[PDB]
């Protein structure tokens, strides 16, 4: 329902904390690093830097996605919005 | 009508020539340069470089605009598309 | 790295408002960043004009190029004011 | 500026296909561009690792960083092949 949604926007927009649990993220980084070089170790701050940048990247993406969703007539964001945003952003997989 | 439109797309997509009349463009450049420095003169190639870059910029913009127009349900491109594109492109006036 | 100075500048602007270590981290990133940016363009300007030395005249043009509208005008003023004092203030 | 070489390379690849002056202009822009790009990163890599000299080891890492996926692998091979010939081919 609309009221809780906005209430959540308001609260999480006022927030400054990392929204993903530290551990799961760290694992994702290790489980990725292993491809490029098997004997790799990341300092905790280096991992931290990645999360700060990762979540920053994502909300920024979300904002743009939101603008696309609204561009039609919707309030609900679909994959096609993330894609249209990333497209115009020049991003690629 | 659809048939002529596509026929025009096909022809102008195959084309490589500058689509704006040289003269009007050159005037626009002079009539702008005058602000920054009154005693300014542009070589013809420098002007040419500006047009190559200007029209390039514009079709590129148009492509993106087109993707926005289509994003709703439309085929006709409106200002709100150019704006949504420029927004996600990070551009500003 | 700049913490000394940025703190010194802080008291000069808000002589009662402190700054966190983490926020100081950011300030340091900012200082190094725009330094890197300005010196990069300055260096670029010098090669273009086939000059082997980076004059203050390059720092200025670099500043005009990288900084926004009116934010650039002050930076030039401040720099000229500063450079001139130093040169005369032998 | 590179027209000599790019033409020399052209005949080597298509010994019957010519190239326009305007197209040659582009090729020259390309050569200078990626040169500027690669040397820029190479230089960046050297300062980071507090080295006063740009080794071929920097050109390589720079190449890995700037060039796409598999397009980078060849460039490294070609460069190593080339460097090694020159070094041994005294």
């Amino acid at each position: 329902p609309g009221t809780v949604a906005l209430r959540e926007i308001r609260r999480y927009q006022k927030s400054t904390e990392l929204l993903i649990r530290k551990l799961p993220f760290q694992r994702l980084v290790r489980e990725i690093a292993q491809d490029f070089k098997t004997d790799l170790r990341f300092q905790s701050s280096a991992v931290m830097a990645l999360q700060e940048a990762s979540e920053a990247y994502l909300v920024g993406l979300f904002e743009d996605t939101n603008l696309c969703a609204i561009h039609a007539k919707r309030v609900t964001i679909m994959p096609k919005d993330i894609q249209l945003a990333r497209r115009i952003r020049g991003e690629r997989a | 009508p659809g048939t002529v439109a596509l026929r025009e797309i096909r022809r102008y997509q195959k084309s490589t020539e500058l689509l704006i009349r040289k003269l009007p463009f050159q005037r626009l450049v002079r009539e702008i340069a005058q602000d920054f420095k009154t005693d300014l003169r542009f070589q013809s190639s420098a002007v040419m470089a500006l047009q190559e870059a200007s029209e390039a910029y514009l079709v590129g913009l148009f492509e993106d605009t087109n993707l926005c127009a289509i994003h709703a349900k439309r085929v006709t491109i409106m200002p709100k598309d150019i704006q949504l594109a420029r927004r996600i492109r990070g551009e500003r006036a | 790295s700049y913490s000394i100075y940025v703190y010194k500048v802080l008291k000069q602007v808000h002589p009662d408002t402190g700054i966190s270590s983490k926020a100081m981290g950011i300030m340091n990133s900012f200082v190094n960043d725009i330094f890197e940016r300005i010196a990069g363009e300055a260096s670029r300007l010098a090669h273009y004009n086939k000059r082997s030395t980076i004059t203050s005249r390059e720092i200025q043009t670099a500043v005009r190029l990288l900084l926004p509208g009116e934010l650039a005008k002050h930076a030039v003023s401040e720099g000229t004011k500063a450079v001139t004092k130093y040169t005369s203030s032998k | 500026s590179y027209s000599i070489y790019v033409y020399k390379v052209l005949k080597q690849v298509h010994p019957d296909t010519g190239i326009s002056s305007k197209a040659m202009g582009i090729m020259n822009s390309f050569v200078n561009d990626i040169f500027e790009r690669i040397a820029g990163e190479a230089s960046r890599l050297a300062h980071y690792n507090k080295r006063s000299t740009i080794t071929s080891r920097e050109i390589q890492t720079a190449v890995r960083l700037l060039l796409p996926g598999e397009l980078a692998k060849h460039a490294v091979s070609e460069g190593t092949k080339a460097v090694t010939k020159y070094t041994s081919s005294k």
Binding site: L6, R10, Q13, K14, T16, E17, A49, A56, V59, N66, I70, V75 | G90 | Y2, Y5, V6, V9, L10, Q12, V13, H14, T17, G18, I19, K22, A23, G25, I26, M27, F30, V31, D33, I34, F35, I38, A39, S43, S52, T53, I54, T55, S56, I59, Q60, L67, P68, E70, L71, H74, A75, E78, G79, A82, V83, K85, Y86, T87, S89, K90 | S52
Partner: protein
Amino acid sequence: KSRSSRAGLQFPVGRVHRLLRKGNYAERVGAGAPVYLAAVLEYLTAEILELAGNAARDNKKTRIIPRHLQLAIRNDEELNKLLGKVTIAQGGVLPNIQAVL
């Protein structure tokens, strides 16, 4: 006497001078170069530090935390361009809800 004081500055003219040559930016950097650059650095520092300090007060605090730098940078239209593609660690995002909601 100090080059930083001769120029009436806080930022280290000397340090900036070292960085300019070490950096391998130039062949030889002039005398006024670091003093001009040091000057601009100090200026911008004061600028964002000012707006930041304001936002710190406006909430309720005395210590400036990243959020303030963020809120500060994003709210000044001119500073927002300069640090457009910059991410302030723990800066968070500027409160904003698209009207249509």
